[PDB]
Amino acid sequence: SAPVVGIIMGSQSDWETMRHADALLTELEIPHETLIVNAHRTPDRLADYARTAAERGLNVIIAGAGGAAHLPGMCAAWTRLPVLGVPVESRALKGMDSLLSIVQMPGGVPVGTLAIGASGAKNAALLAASILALYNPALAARLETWRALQTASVPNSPIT
Amino acid sequence: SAPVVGIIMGSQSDWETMRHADALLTELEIPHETLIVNAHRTPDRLADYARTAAERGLNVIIAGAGGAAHLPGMCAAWTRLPVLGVPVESRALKGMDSLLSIVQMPGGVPVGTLAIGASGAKNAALLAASILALYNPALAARLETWRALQTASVPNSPITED
Amino acid sequence: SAPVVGIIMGSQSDWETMRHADALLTELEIPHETLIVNAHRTPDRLADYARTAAERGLNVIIAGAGGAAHLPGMCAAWTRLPVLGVPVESRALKGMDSLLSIVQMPGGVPVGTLAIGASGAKNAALLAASILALYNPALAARLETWRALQTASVPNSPIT
Amino acid sequence: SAPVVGIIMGSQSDWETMRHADALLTELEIPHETLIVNAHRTPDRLADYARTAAERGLNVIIAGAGGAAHLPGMCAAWTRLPVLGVPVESRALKGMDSLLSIVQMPGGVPVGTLAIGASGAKNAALLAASILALYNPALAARLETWRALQTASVPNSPITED
């Protein structure tokens, strides 16, 4: 089936983080594509990807980047689709540079930003799912089940 | 007529920021409600608002809070709807406490976080609009027009006179 | 005996930190319960726990959380008991996110916040003990002994 | 009549912040004393105040300090009473130095720390009240009334007019 979510990242090194978004979308059976698109090394690839995303049938883009993290913001610049940004943990500054360069978008071009690291990648997929669930009843039911299981599965006490 | 976006905030002091979300939704002709829901002073009000939002017909919640900013995250805990968070600028720490309190949600319960302050509020409304536009062709057209006009309206050079 | 302190945390991963609170309360023979309550995954469990804490005979709640750490503040929202918050060290931001999301409570609903990590968990238990000692003479004497031993046991010089 | 809470601070400049603790204790009818004790300029005064607090009948100490804020931690070093710390906002670093200097106590000597500034001072008094209410039923009733009124007084919607 045709992808409705695009997951993009700038390098193989981002995959350790973004694989968590990929896994969640697969778990919820949301058709998606997972690609490398680098804002700095392949800016024309980025322009083409973002500009054509809507006409290709994409509904949400999840973009991960670390350091001076420009990939989500520049993606949002070229598409009217919702763009969700995952700050990848950077070696020196632990993703604080990633976080500020993604979340601090000036008014007019938004990026919905999630937590630094694996938690953010998982949550970007969940946020994408909740967006798609607004107009897909079967997915809405699967997301309901996912959240219910998450809630029900929390133990009552720690193991010592 | 019925609201499809809920804008919530903890206090009147937040309105100076959240009014920018309200204005943009109105500009794009998106029906919405604006309420005060305080995570710490009215936690049962929050639980009820969030847990009933979907059945009331809301599609997106925009939540603003400052300091130890728990309102967006706790809203997301009770709803399956997308929740967007606006960090309100705080006096001492300039919204850094607001930002980290909102964006650093552990995996399992998301909040899509926007920039600190008025920019974030405007962008939360634009993000909400982009979500709604996925299923609403008239709104999708209004949003494309809005984005195209924003692009066309950027001047080519600064005014450089003394 | 019935618990007078509740120790709560959002996940098993918090136990490495919160076990230090548990150990100290046991050392001082303070009856307590140690539970998992997750603000985000089990918010109704949290509401019920905090709302009924006083009528169950709890006197102090010690709550640990990391990241966007909402557990202590939301607990305080539903109870009139003193709530003490332990910021758990987070992977990327080393508990600075945990610390700010716990300590920066707006006026009207307090959380007494302790240091990031194991030190904070130990100190939350000690702070709970000093609260209980105000109206329990036998405990006050044991706490006096604990503090005296801590003071007396500090060596006079380092081992080389 | 005799004080059961001590509010201490290093200088008159701290009073702008600590007065919020004082006001709240008075509102809840909690007898207290307010003193200046400077950790660095009057260290022997601090030692004496802290080491005699319990025998003088104090139950809780609220200590405020800014910058390299050592007053709460050193107070806790000499008393077995619960000590609550209020980081006072500093000029350059906006109370971040105050906060870290107070909250990051190594294990063994606790300080329950509240928010930077006026919010923290008000909350230190509320936390002190919640501690005292554990053994004082009349105060417990006054505190429940206060919290209930705070909850009931939150408006349902912001004032949104231009």
Add this chain to the structure above:
Amino acid sequence: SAPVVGIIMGSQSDWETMRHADALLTELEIPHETLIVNAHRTPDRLADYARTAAERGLNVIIAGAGGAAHLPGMCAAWTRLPVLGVPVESRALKGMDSLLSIVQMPGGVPVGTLAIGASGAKNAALLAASILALYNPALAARLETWRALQTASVPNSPITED
């Protein structure tokens, strides 16, 4: 006559900062152009400006941006010319978001970053001048004179009167 340095910025609000770069280039008689290019609102304008800069005869680009400051880095992505970045001071985070967004470029695409604010803008122009002076002897002489005068003009003692 033709420009050899391009000064670009995302909005008119940046000019208060970037005007210091403009003034210094003029002082050193370096022909330049000043334009608004917004990375987020006019991304195709940016692509075209950056990809054609070298063939248009530009030698150095000075780019200023604040907040999530992507303009310098994205300019460098499309040009082989040296790109110098000026972090513009932002309201909440005082240009720290600007600074990290510009300087923390991953290996492979450089931006030479200067200080936050007006100092950085002046220094971007001086750095551009020092690059151009490597091949332009008349400019090298003007720059040496400028640096020598800066050194000679430092007073020996402060004015200490009350």
Add this chain to the structure above:
Amino acid sequence: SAPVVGIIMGSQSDWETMRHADALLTELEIPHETLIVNAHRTPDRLADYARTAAERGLNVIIAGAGGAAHLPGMCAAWTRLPVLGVPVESRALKGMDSLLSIVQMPGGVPVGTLAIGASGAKNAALLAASILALYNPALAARLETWRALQTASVPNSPIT
């Protein structure tokens, strides 16, 4: 051939970082010298190095330092050549001290600052190359090739 770029650093411990600048200059066949010059321990060596750099035929200086990182700024003080600064990652503060002490130069004496760590060292060499390419056509072509290969070599998808 005579060096046109100088790479300087304060200690052997900086070499793990600055070797990336050295490798890139060699890859692009840019003649250079790689030296230890310590701002604090050998300040007269620094003064002489920076003061004579231009007359020796150097065109760009790349200077790396960590902690209270004064080497780039003080180099710039004595030369009219462009000075590029690489913040070396420090043990405690992860190069945030290095970054601020290099980039925050007051107006009048510039240092072009690159990212913390190995990325910054590589990018300082690339920035130096782009400066030299302005007036060396053969190098400009090699830099074009380098950038083109970087762009072309980015994979289209991650390896799972």
Add this chain to the structure above:
Amino acid sequence: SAPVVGIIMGSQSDWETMRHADALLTELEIPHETLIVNAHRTPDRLADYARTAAERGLNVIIAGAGGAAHLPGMCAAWTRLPVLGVPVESRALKGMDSLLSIVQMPGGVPVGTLAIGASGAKNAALLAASILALYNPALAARLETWRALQTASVPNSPITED
């Protein structure tokens, strides 16, 4: 009569801060000189000042700088005298860049660093006084009197009126 402390700073703008060091030395009757030495604009002036300070009879150097604050560290590089550093508050980063640039000296060349701003300048003078008092009994007596008076002058309670 001859100076035993040198107070140096990079510009007149630093004097608003460094004047507090000057005033305290005068109060304690410590002969000193006050000069402008800019690490970046007058590096040879700095080298000469620092390398000759000991033979000129100086015992302590107090150096103030803001931003990328290199003056204290580079002074210490050329002198064997104790060098005390005062971080001057900067506009954007509130002296955090000043502080880290001064205090984070690698092992081998020390700078004793004081607080950001006016407090640090006053304390640099007091620290210089405490160093000089080790060998000067009259000054040691004046310093003890000063510290004793500081202690005696702390009020017992705040002024709490409305």
Add this chain to the structure above:
Amino acid sequence: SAPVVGIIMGSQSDWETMRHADALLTELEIPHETLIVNAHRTPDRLADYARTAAERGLNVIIAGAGGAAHLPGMCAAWTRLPVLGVPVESRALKGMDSLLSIVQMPGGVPVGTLAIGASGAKNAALLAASILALYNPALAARLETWRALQTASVPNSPIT
């Protein structure tokens, strides 16, 4: 011989850092004492130590602490001697808490603060030495030699 410098620290865990101060003083043959004094656990020990330091013949105190680091400031409160503070690297916040709680002393009671960690401990000893050298000619000559050797020993190029 009687100690003229006191090195104090709050716990054995600080010794890994403060041993560098001890080693430097021994290298320069400066008589000193190395002690554990904990501001929070042994405050009366601290009061007595600082109050009597001058009359015991101490000239400089070097105090190391981490976290909420109160030891140097409180030492300075009770003595007119120069007090030098070493921020010990803390687990979570990497000594940023240590640094701010030591350096940000309000006007009236100074602490001369050195770098976070081992570098700061070494430099506190060197700063103490330079203070003592003002009125001890033999030590001044040894310190001159130490600094000269440090300067002369810096290599001219890195080892590859």
